[PDB]
């Protein structure tokens, strides 16, 4: 087309708007390919994600529409946004390809983890994560799968979350490197099948902060049995009132584990790992409130934002910024034929 041009990217071809130049592959998976590009209209770099075979089957089609709907629910500087969405095909009948354009960031938290950070940068990165997470929650989106590889950063110390609401396979994070498995970051209520609420994301933030501090994965379980053990060995055997909430067989498994005292937080995060004396105490205290097995006793997002270690950055405009829409979960249980999903997606793309 006059507006589009084609560029070969390994074994696929990107047909994109002419404003997007110098495309180069930065990530790839069975579910999509991501290129870095220069956006000549904005004079900014951009990430372009081409969905792979979105109409292969009903599942992929529903997933494609859902990704698009999730992106319109949010509008916050600590959450990746959809700068643009397009298709090079000119009618519904020819319609096949969907391209998503998002901000190109510089690294994910895997890179930050190995760095030694002052309290200002540590707390500020955490504060941005929390602002991002609060916004998702206000939009009816609970992430559940937060981890260093789906949190991205820039050299100006800004931070954005990606892959909210996406299956851990259709996400941008899965397509790119470095990558870490989600198992290490999942809350006890998730791995023990108890159901979860908003502060499921606080546990993950705690695991990530813990890893930024220790420069090593907090709970590197080889599987979900190992995962649970690693948690209890370090944090201690949870209270009886927590265990009573468990389903019958898993409750007995958990109750029959040897009883562990668990290490104190000064033991888990010694001064050795921190730079100033009030700030290390404050960080350790925040950690001891996020890394709490029982969600009923775990700190919420609002209280985390109010915590002394984080609160220094508080700006009500960043915290109380409301989402454009609230995600309708009736979408999760909606059925359409592929052709019907395709028309729905097409309308959203041409919107």
């Amino acid at each position: 087309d006059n507006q589009f041009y084609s560029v070969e990217v390994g074994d696929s071809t990107f047909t994109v708007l002419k404003r997007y130049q110098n495309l180069k592959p930065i990530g790839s998976g069975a579910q999509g390919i991501v290129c870095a590009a220069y956006d000549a209209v904005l004079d900014r770099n951009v990430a372009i994600k081409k969905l792979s075979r979105p109409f292969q089957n009903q599942t992929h089609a529903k997933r494609a529409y859902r990704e698009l709907v999730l992106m319109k629910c949010v509008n916050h500087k600590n959450i990746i946004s959809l700068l643009n969405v397009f298709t090079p095909q000119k009618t519904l009948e020819e319609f096949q390809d969907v391209y998503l354009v998002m901000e190109l960031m510089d690294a994910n938290l895997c890179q930050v983890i190995q760095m030694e950070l002052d309290h200002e940068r540590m707390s500020y990165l955490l504060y941005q994560m929390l602002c991002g997470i609060k916004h998702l929650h206000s939009a009816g989106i609970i992430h559940r799968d937060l981890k260093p590889s789906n949190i991205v950063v820039k050299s100006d110390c800004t931070l954005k979350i990606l892959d909210f609401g996406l299956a851990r396979t259709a996400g941008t994070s899965f397509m790119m490197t470095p990558y870490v498995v989600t198992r290490y970051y999942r809350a006890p209520e998730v791995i023990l099948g108890m159901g979860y609420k908003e502060n499921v994301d606080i546990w993950s933030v705690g695991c990530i902060m813990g890893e930024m501090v220790r420069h090593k994965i907090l709970f590197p379980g080889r599987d979900y049995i190992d995962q649970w053990n690693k948690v209890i060995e370090q944090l201690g055997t949870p209270c009886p009132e927590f265990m009573k909430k468990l389903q019958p067989t898993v409750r007995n498994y958990v109750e029959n584990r040897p009883k562990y005292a668990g290490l104190t937080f000064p033991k888990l995060f010694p001064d050795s790992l921190f730079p100033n004396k009030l700030k290390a105490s404050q960080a350790r205290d925040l950690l001891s409130k996020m890394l709490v097995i029982d969600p009923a006793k775990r700190i919420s997002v609002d209280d985390a934002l109010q915590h002394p270690y984080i609160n220094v950055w508080y700006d009500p405009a960043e915290v109380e910024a409301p989402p454009p829409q609230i995600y309708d979960k009736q979408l999760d249980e909606r059925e359409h034929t592929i052709e019907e999903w395709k028309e729905l997606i097409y309308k959203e793309v041409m919107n």
Binding site: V112, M115, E120, K154, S155, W313
Partner: peptide
Amino acid sequence: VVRPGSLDLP
């Protein structure tokens, strides 16, 4: 306070 405006990424 001033927010950090840089991050020493590799």
